[PDB]
């Protein structure tokens, strides 16, 4: 899982720091 809304795409999300990605994917999944 590397996106949730259309505002997210794997390329920038990989340029992203892992710990912020960790927040994002976990919260995205939680509110999901």
């Amino acid at each position: 899982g590397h996106m949730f809304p259309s505002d997210i795409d794997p390329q920038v999300f990989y340029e992203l720091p892992e710990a912020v990605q960790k927040e994002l994917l976990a919260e995205w999944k939680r509110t999901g």
Binding site: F4, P5, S6, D7, I8, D9, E27
Partner: protein, 76 residues
Amino acid sequence: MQIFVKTLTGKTITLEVEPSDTIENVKAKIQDKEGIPPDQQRLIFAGKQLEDGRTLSDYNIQKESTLHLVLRLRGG
């Protein structure tokens, strides 16, 4: 000055600010450009995360410099 906020979808939204402009007011310009409220939006620079009470200069960002925009769901 201007800075290039890359959004997480692979977009780059340029916005016009000052080095002394706060991250909060930068995120508020993202709300103008993207529609996302600041409390729900996060800001990264160079593999590091910023806070609303800090400024571009606090992170040593200058003009024609790139930023990263994420969605962080909520805050309060």
